[PDB]
Design a protein around this ligand. Structure first.
Ligand code: SF4
Lengths: 367, 797, 411, 370
């Protein structure tokens, strides 16, 4: 049991490592302290608020020594008017489709679910909403938080936030024991998302995760995606007679058995319907599975970038295209680097601070 | 070591202060009487904010207005969240109130109370307006009956010649007084009084005083305890001419000496038989009649004059004048409740029942002339008085009237005097007042075996969690009482010392009586906590249990001889004490198995029972229709000219619908379709024309005019000043109904189902299925063509 | 529109008649509204007042006189009615429903004394441009008939056939205007249902609508296609299903009459034939208008002149209200809510006004308007009735009265 | 103002049959016109609270417009009545935030109904009194526009103006723009403007300082026993009318009180228990022929017969909850369509276990368990 960071490790982290100036400049939307910071809510979670300057923010967090803090709305008075539009994505809703990790483990293989979720959400935020100023942040374990800082995104009402969420949240029913039966024809966003996800389905789902090699798991999550009972009963019999066929073999058996069953002038309707079921299953397995609550209301609190995760010791760092959870620096490793070189600029944290600074510099230019 | 300590016994109200009477210990370990005057007491008022308003809003309105009326410089007030759970419908379960402390002593209008229904735009109710001062003190300071009181800041020089007490002090604020935990109490000075009267007005002939100066309730009182002093006073009943006997020439002299003796004796308790509502009244009125100046020594406050209205209020005056001395009456309601084996509660009877001693009462009549010259008669009469006096005392001690009432008072938190001289209601009231107030609630403003089922209701309230708030307050209170009673009975089984054991038995009894009286709180109609829905709820469950208790008895092959909510009598079917008791216990166990909180017991064992009623027995004890109602008929004329109403394919003496059409019965000629339809159409048009004539009629039955004149205010009647409403006399509803009726005549489905309106009443001189079906189909074409002529105008409407 | 009668709406219409005349009087005589006051209450001062002539009791005797009449709008006098004192006025003609304007005084509270009658002004006449009149130029004959067309004791249209032959081959008019009733619902054989078998019809009619198609249509069809023929109904027409005045036009297709030369018009209707404006109405105002009259000069005039002037002044073809009743059998059958449609279209007086009556046929010029009653085409007994022939010589006032000759011809 | 200048002002303010009520109008009329508009707005709110479709609401309000507030007339007086009633209600509803929000909601819905009742020509004239895309931009986006619209010229607008169409994926989205909905844009602008004008009206209201404004603002505002009648054991025996009345009484705390009071008397609720029942329920016998004869229930009423008074949609949902099959529901609805309400009710009795009295329905239901 790798114990999480001690209280003294958190004191050291806030004293010497946490990028208070960059987080303040991000949330203040200006080089000069403003009401975007003075009237911003912070919540502190302890092992058992609002700030006027970088110095006040640092001194209050150092004095309080919280295990984390969470960023809220800008208010009309010092602690809702504005807040960054936020999305949260965790691995939990992908647990039924991964074999490389169990329970609360993560690796570069299942991280591809989060990478695809970020890619599809980014496509919608950029191309459909016209947003420019967003950043992804590692949740410190097995998820990622998006922060959309465009002025138009900050000023969204709860009704508009709900409409943005309902546009991106295609998979509303997360139950894998049932066919999604998505609306046809697909909305342009959903059609585009399918074409972006299709190239990854064979390599991730059929080969790297191979979740349906297990015949009970194939009965529980592959068969319920099909529309036809005679096809389901025929596949179930065929896999009972021929156990432990790979996900790739079972994927082809679906088409072979369907072609044997559906003959004559109605066959084309069954072929179209089977293709639609396979497409709905590509989306069920790989499409973004957002936490819906954090996005809906302007007042929702979300964990600050660069917080420490209390169980893993990982820093909640900004994400680039190369990111995997094993690249997130741990507080204990950063302390060991600081013992050799008593300067944060010489630690594994500095590249992530530089990435975040470049983002904040772009945002302030757009503002 | 720096505080004045007093054991309080009684109280009285005067000039918006509260006086407590009690005992103080002196340096020689002896205890004397004392009084404490308490100033600074306030009424606790709670103002209930209006929808949208706050307590601060209330503070702004009434506080300044209250300063004016009462003439106060400042009034302590503050917001406070309080719970409400009683019978006023418009008050919420919980709210923020403005708690205002209004002193009882105010410079102005101190006798004027704030009504609960005070008009205001910030609040719509006010609790605590009519608070009683004793109640306020006891509830605010958590005083639970007679106990030791630590009193700080006692002023020993303020009070002058106010009482008949040895020690007089005062305090500026009630918070200076707190109760201590000390369980022991000082000895009490008891004085037994026996009075012999004479009917002239009831006049007093003699008085016997027996003093017991060291009655300790901390240990059992020894049987046949002898008085430290015994004295008898007497005046001559007609003319002017053991222990001490004192003779006086008249009644005024006698009563004067009596009062003087009372003052010097300074008893804490006055014991007697039927004092409360017989002899104390006679004593009071005679002292009044004879203008005895020292009359106040019957109590402990000094007055030179009687109340103005003295001469129902008489009860209060006397009780008030006696304040300071507890009235221990063995034959009042409380006394009777401890002696249920009595029937008359006559002195000799009580003596027999409680002490198993016989005294044959002499009927003394001082009207008889023999008492003026016969010295032996006078002496025997005085002996009777002396005997009665000492009997009354002995009985009061044997039935443990003081200890039991004290324990009951400590449990309910009321006044000892109220327990001794009141009904159950008082105890029931205060036990709840203390309970609720302490948990942030606002209280309302002021062989046959006899099986005991007294615990029925308190077990129901506890089992089914019945409360004003619903575990609720009342059930929790009962549970605690039952639990503590068990704790006591557990300690008894082990206790060896007879003193402590007897004490436990008293404690145990008091706890039982308290619990078994709780129902009165919500059941008694005139109770401060009366709640009919709760009473009914508890009563109904009580019936069920009793009804089922019967079935249970029968399941053991027992017979219920009699029963009610207090007791159930069962025929055991045995002729042996042992067998009877076993059956009795078996039934006891059975009842408890079905009702875990109901523990009944065997109260009476009847070897034989001659029964007539509960307390009357001898025994050996062991120890379309409406739519067309006003339409008019379609009248056809025969192309022979006879006229007749046409009612469809129905019977008629004038016409027949035959297989080849409508036929006239007078001349046998058949109508052609045009001969029928031209007439249908002609009638329709006559109706439509009448309708367009536009006659109007007035509503008002005393006017009724019909006219075609229409005022430029259409509905207005043209009769000077008539207020009726004008309506088209042929309404468009009536026209439409008339046409729908015509339509029905030529409707095949309606003809076949025989649903048309009759053309003739039974008494009409022209009163007239398978034929109708057939004839209707044979004439379908005629019908439909007749019908189309009506429809020409129905679609156009 | 359906058969609804709504009292509020009827009263609205009656109110509006008083108010619109109040504005016509004020513009014509150039008076200010402050000169008008409530005649139902006492004043010291003479006032102008406008109102409707009504009886002085709502349950009144059949026969009225100058001592038994009353006169306000809702704004004028809260709709109150006040008895008229006409003793200071020597010459007058009033009728029930007439809108009138007075100068007078209510001296004591219970009567309004009329000092003078302000006559309502005659409506303007239509005009035409020189271009329009030249097109019309590039004599006009109009024939007018009015039902009944068959007698009371038979179903002969022999006289109508004779007439049709005459107009087709001799008279050759440009337009023929025919007023109902065609099949009169109060014809006594129709009323009693004494309708015979017709041997000249292969299939007998089953309804009065079918009786029209078999009896009238084939004869009407023989009118020359060169003669435009206009049909205007009566509220007594069995063939109409709208038995109130104003009355919707008949439906030509339903009557199976040819489009080539038949037009069905409303009752009333107004139209032009070339420049000439016709106003046609088929309720018998001339029979029904019962004047209350004072004065030798008024009484020595011809009744038909006085009645025509009342109609022109009132600017509506049947100004009597309540409308007359035939006692129930028939009547004016006014649909009060739609009296609006019976007002002179555009506020214009017609050049020719045709209002058939059961009185003797007549043609008269009154206030430069040609007023024509053609009389009934056939008499009840079966004797010849009459019809009217109008011959008219071929911005500008039409002066039809100067150019028109009207003959009343035995049919 | 001479009556002619006033007429010219109203001719200019009403070139369209619809108005945003931008300019102020230049006692019996004041009160009647306010009451007549207020009745229409309360009927709108009553229909909205009952989740009626826009087309059902349009059908109910159409006869009320002809009676109380004629729209689409050339009458100057009807146009005046519409203006003045709107501005008079601004004075009534400006006083509290809740009154403003209710008025803006009802008035914006009234605007939507009236706009839908206009001709396409009158709608276009009103809009003239929303940029279309070029044919090139349409050609570039043609595939994505067609895919979006297939299930259902293009207008390009910020997506924030069509959030309701975005949530349903009825509009195409690119770069923060929606490719379309004009009525929703106009309704939001109307609602925003009206809310701003109500705030301004409230700021000036102290200078106007009343009985009519106060009144109009306020116009918007035993086995069988008092407890057992609310229990499933007893209530499972009630017919639908008694169910309706009940659910109401519970939700909201004359005709309905009489129908329910007399029914409860008929089932054996004593006088004393009935007074407890009503006192407790106010927290803040007729046969079917008689019930049906009473004035029809309106918004806020629960008397009458649900088989006549409820839509087939509402009845079907209720009958589905009662476990009735589709064939059974069709049979009940067929009776309703025929006006045979007691037959429909008898069918429900039989299918859930001729009756023409609610007390007989209850008694028969109880007899089946005894
Ligand atoms: S038919 Fe009668 S009992 Fe049934 S719901 Fe209707 S009114 Fe009630």
């Amino acid at each position: 049991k790798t114990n999480g960071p001690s209280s003294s490790d958190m004191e050291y982290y806030y004293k010497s490592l946490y990028p208070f100036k960059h987080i303040f400049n991000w949330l203040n939307h200006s080089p000069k302290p403003s009401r975007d910071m003075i009237n911003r809510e912070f919540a502190m979670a302890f092992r058992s608020n609002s700030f006027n300057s970088v110095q006040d923010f640092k001194a209050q967090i150092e004095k309080a020594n919280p295990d984390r803090f969470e960023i809220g709305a800008i208010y009309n008075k010092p602690p809702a008017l504005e807040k960054e539009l936020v999305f949260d994505i965790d691995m939990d809703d992908y647990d039924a489709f991964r074999t490389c990790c169990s329970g609360a483990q993560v690796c570069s293989k299942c991280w591809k679910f989060i990478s695809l979720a970020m890619k599809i959400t980014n496509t919608a935020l950029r191309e459909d909403f016209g947003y420019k100023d967003f950043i992804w942040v590692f949740s410190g374990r097995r998820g990622a938080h998006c922060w959309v800082s465009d002025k138009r995104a900050r000023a969204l009402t709860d009704v508009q936030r709900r409409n943005v969420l309902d546009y991106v949240n295609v998979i509303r029913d997360r139950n894998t024991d049932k066919r999604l039966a998505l609306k046809r024809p697909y909305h342009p966003h959903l059609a585009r998302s399918l074409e972006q996800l299709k190239p990854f389905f064979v390599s991730i789902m059929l080969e790297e995760q191979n979740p349906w090699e297990d015949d009970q798991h194939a009965i529980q999550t592959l068969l319920p995606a099909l529309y036809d009972k005679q096809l389901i009963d025929s596949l179930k019999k065929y896999w009972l007679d021929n156990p432990r066929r790979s996900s790739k073999e079972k994927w082809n058996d679906i088409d072979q058995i369907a072609t044997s069953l559906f003959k004559g002038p109605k066959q084309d309707s069954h072929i179209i319907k089977l293709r639609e079921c396979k497409e709905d299953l590509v989306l069920m397995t790989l499409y973004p599975k957002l936490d819906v609550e954090v996005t809906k209301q302007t007042i929702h609190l979300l964990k600050a970038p660069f917080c420490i995760h209390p169980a893993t010791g990982n820093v909640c760092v900004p994400i680039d295209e190369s990111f995997a959870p094993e690249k997130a620096p741990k507080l204990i490793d950063l302390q060991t680097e600081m013992e050799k070189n008593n300067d944060v600029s010489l630690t594994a944290l500095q590249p992530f601070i530089n990435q975040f600074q470049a983002y904040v510099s772009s945002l302030l230019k757009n503002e | 070591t720096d505080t004045f300590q007093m054991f309080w016994l009684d109280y009285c109200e005067v000039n918006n202060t509260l006086i407590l009477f009690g005992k103080v210990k002196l340096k020689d370990d002896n205890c004397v009487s004392a009084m404490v005057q308490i100033n600074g007491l306030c009424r606790e008022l709670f103002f209930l904010p209006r929808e949208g308003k706050t307590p601060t809003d209330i503070h702004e309105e009434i506080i300044p207005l209250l300063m004016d009326k009462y003439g106060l410089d400042n009034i302590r007030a503050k917001p406070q969240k309080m719970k409400y759970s009683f019978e006023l419908p418009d008050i919420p379960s919980e709210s923020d109130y403005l708690k205002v402390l209004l002193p009882y002593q105010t410079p102005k209008s101190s006798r004027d109370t704030i009504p609960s229904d005070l008009s205001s735009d910030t609040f719509y109710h006010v609790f605590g307006g009519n608070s009683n001062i004793f109640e306020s003190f006891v509830i605010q300071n958590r005083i639970m009956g007679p106990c030791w009181l630590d009193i700080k800041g006692a002023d020993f020089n303020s009070i002058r010649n106010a009482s008949h007490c040895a020690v007089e002090v005062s305090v500026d604020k009630p918070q200076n007084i707190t109760p201590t935990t000390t369980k022991t109490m000082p000895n009490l000075r008891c004085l037994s009084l026996s009075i012999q009267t004479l009917m002239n007005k009831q006049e007093i002939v003699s008085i016997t005083l027996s003093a017991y100066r060291n009655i300790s309730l901390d240990s059992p009182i020894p049987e046949n305890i002898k008085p430290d002093d015994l004295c008898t006073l007497v005046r001559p009943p007609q003319s002017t001419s053991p222990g001490r006997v004192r003779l006086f020439n008249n009644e005024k002299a006698m009563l004067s000496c009596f009062c003087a003796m009372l003052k010097v004796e300074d008893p804490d308790v006055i014991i007697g038989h039927r004092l409360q509502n017989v002899y104390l009244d006679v004593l009071a009125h005679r002292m009044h009649d004879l203008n005895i100046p020292t009359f106040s020594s019957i109590g402990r406050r000094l007055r030179r004059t009687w109340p103005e209205k003295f001469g129902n209020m008489n009860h209060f005056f006397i009780s008030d004048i006696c304040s300071g001395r507890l009235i221990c009456d063995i034959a009042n309601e409380m006394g009777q409740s401890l002696t249920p084996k009595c029937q008359s509660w006559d002195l000799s009877e009580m003596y027999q029942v409680t002490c198993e001693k016989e005294h044959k009462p002499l009927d003394i009549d001082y009207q008889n002339p023999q008492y003026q010259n016969d010295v032996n008669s006078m002496t025997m009469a005085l002996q009777e008085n002396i005997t009665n006096c000492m009997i009354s005392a002995e009985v009061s001690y044997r039935i443990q009237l003081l200890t039991l009432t004290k324990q009951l008072t400590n449990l309910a938190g009321n006044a000892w005097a109220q327990t001794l001289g009141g009904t159950r209601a008082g105890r029931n009231e205060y036990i709840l007042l203390h309970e609720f107030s302490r948990n942030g609630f606002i209280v309302p403003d002021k062989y046959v075996l006899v099986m005991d089922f007294n615990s029925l209701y308190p077990s129901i309230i506890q089992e089914f969690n019945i409360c004003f708030t619903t575990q609720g307050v009342l059930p929790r209170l009962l549970a605690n009482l039952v639990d503590r009673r068990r704790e006591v009975k557990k300690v008894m089984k082990t206790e060896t010392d007879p003193h402590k054991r007897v004490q436990c038995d008293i404690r145990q009894q008091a706890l039982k009586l308290t619990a078994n009286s709780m129902y009165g709180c919500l059941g008694y109609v005139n109770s401060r906590f009366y709640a009919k829905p709760l009473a009914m709820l508890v009563t109904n469950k009580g019936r069920e249990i009793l009804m089922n208790t019967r079935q249970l008895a029968e399941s053991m092959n027992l017979l219920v001889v009699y029963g009610d909510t207090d007791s159930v009598m069962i025929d055991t079917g045995c002729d042996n004490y042992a067998d009877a008791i076993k059956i009795g216990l078996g039934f006891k166990r059975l009842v408890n198995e079905r009702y875990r909180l109901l523990e009944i017991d065997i109260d009476n064992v009847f070897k034989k029972l001659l029964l007539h009623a509960k307390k009357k027995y001898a025994a050996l004890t062991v120890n379309d229709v409406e739519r067309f109602k006003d339409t008019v008929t379609l009248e056809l004329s025969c192309p022979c000219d006879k006229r007749f109403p046409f009612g469809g394919i129905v019977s008629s003496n004038y016409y027949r619908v035959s297989y080849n059409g409508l036929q006239c019965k007078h001349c046998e000629q058949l109508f052609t379709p045009l001969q029928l339809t031209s007439q249908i159409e002609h009638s329709i048009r006559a109706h439509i024309s009448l309708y367009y004539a536009g006659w109007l009629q007035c509503d008002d039955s005393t006017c009724g005019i019909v006219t075609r004149q229409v005022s430029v205010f259409g509905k207005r009647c043209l009769n000077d000043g008539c207020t009726g409403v004008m309506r088209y006399k042929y309404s468009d509803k009536q026209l439409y109904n008339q046409l729908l009726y015509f339509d029905s005549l030529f409707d095949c489905e309606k003809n076949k189902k025989q649903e048309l309106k009759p053309i003739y009443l039974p008494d009409d001189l022209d009163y007239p299925e398978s034929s109708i079906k057939a004839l209707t189909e044979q004439n379908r074409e005629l019908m439909e063509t007749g019908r189309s002529v009506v429809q020409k105008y129905l679609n156009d409407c | 529109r359906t058969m609804r009668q709504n009292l509020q709406e009827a009263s609205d219409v009656l109110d509006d008649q008083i108010e619109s005349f109040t504005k016509i009087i004020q513009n014509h005589y150039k008076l200010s509204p402050n000169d008008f006051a409530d005649p139902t209450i006492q004043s010291q001062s003479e006032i102008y007042a406008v109102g409707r002539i009504v009886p002085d009791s709502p349950t009144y005797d059949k026969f009225l006189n100058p001592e038994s009449l009353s006169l306000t709008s809702r704004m004028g006098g809260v709709g109150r009615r006040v008895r008229l004192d006409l003793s200071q006025v020597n010459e007058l003609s009033f009728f029930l429903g007439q809108i009138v304007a007075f100068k007078g005084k209510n001296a004591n509270g219970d009567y309004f004394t009329v000092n003078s009658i302000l006559p309502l002004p005659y409506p303007n006449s239509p005009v035409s441009t020189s271009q329009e009149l030249q097109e019309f130029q590039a004599s006009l004959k109009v024939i007018v008939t009015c039902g009944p067309y068959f007698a009371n004791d038979n179903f002969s249209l022999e006289l109508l056939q004779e007439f049709i032959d005459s107009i087709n081959n001799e008279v050759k008019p440009h337009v023929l205007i025919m007023f109902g009733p065609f099949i009169d619902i109060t014809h006594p054989l129709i009323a009693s249902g004494k309708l015979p078998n017709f041997p000249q019809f292969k299939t007998q009619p089953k309804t009065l609508d079918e009786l029209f198609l078999k009896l009238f249509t084939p004869i009407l069809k023989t009118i020359s296609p060169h003669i435009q023929t206009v049909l205007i109904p009566s509220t007594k027409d069995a063939i109409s299903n709208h038995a109130a005045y104003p009355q919707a036009s008949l439906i030509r297709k339903a009557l199976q009459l040819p489009k080539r030369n038949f037009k069905c018009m409303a009752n009333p209707s107004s139209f032009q034939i070339n420049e000439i404006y016709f106003g046609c109405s088929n309720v018998d105002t001339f029979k029904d208008l019962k004047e209350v009259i004072k004065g030798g000069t008024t009484s020595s005039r011809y009744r038909l002149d006085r009645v025509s002037e009342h109609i022109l002044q009132q600017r509506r073809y049947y100004p009597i209200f309540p409308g007359s009743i035939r006692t129930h059998i028939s009547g004016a059958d006014l649909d009060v809510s739609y009296l609006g449609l019976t007002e002179f279209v555009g506020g214009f007086s017609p050049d020719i006004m045709i209002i058939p009556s059961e009185l003797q046929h007549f043609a008269r010029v009154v206030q430069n308007v040609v007023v024509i009653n053609p009389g009934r085409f056939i008499r009840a007994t079966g004797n010849r009735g009459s019809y009217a022939q109008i011959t008219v010589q071929c911005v500008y006032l039409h002066n039809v009265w100067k150019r028109a000759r009207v003959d009343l011809i035995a049919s | 103002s001479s009556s002619e200048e006033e007429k010219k002002l109203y001719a200019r303010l009403y070139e369209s049959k619809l108005s945003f009520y931008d300019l102020p109008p230049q006692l019996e009329q004041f009160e009647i016109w306010a009451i007549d508009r207020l009745k229409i707005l309360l009927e709108i709110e009553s229909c909205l609270s009952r989740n009626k479709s826009i087309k059902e609401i349009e059908t109910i309000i159409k006869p009320q417009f002809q009676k109380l507030l004629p729209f689409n007339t050339e009458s100057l007086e009807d146009r005046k009545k519409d203006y003045y009633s709107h501005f008079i209600l601004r004075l009534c509803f400006c006083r509290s935030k809740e009154l403003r929000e209710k008025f803006v909601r009802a008035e914006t819905f009234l605007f939507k109904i009236r706009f839908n009742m206009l001709t396409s020509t009158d709608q276009t004239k009103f809009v003239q009194s929303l940029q279309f895309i070029s044919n090139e931009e349409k050609a570039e986006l043609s595939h994505q526009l067609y895919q979006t619209v297939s299930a259902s010229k293009f207008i390009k607008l910020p997506f924030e103006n069509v959030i309701e169409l975005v949530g349903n994926r009825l509009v195409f989205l690119k770069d923060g723009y929606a490719y379309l909905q004009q009525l929703n844009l106009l309704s939001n602008e109307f609602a925003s403007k009206l809310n701003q004008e109500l705030i301004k009206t409230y700021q000036y209201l102290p200078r106007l300082n009343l009985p009519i404004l106060n009144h109009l603002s306020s116009g918007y505002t035993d086995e069988i026993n008092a407890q057992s009648v609310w229990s499933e054991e007893i209530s499972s025996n009630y017919p639908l009318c008694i169910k309706n009345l009940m659910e109401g009484l519970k939700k909201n705390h004359y005709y309905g009180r009489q129908q329910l009071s007399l029914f409860l008397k008929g089932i054996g609720l004593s006088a004393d228990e009935a007074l407890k029942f009503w006192s407790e329920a106010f927290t803040n016998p007729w046969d079917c022929h008689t019930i049906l004869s009473k004035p029809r229930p309106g918004r806020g009423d629960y008397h009458g017969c649900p088989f006549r008074d409820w839509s087939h949609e509402r009845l079907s949902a209720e009958l589905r909850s009662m476990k009735l099959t589709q064939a059974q529901i069709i049979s009940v609805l067929d009776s309703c369509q025929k006006g045979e309400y007691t037959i429909a009710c008898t069918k429900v009795f039989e299918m859930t276990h001729h009756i023409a009295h609610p007390n007989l329905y209850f008694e028969r239901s109880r007899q089946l368990q005894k």
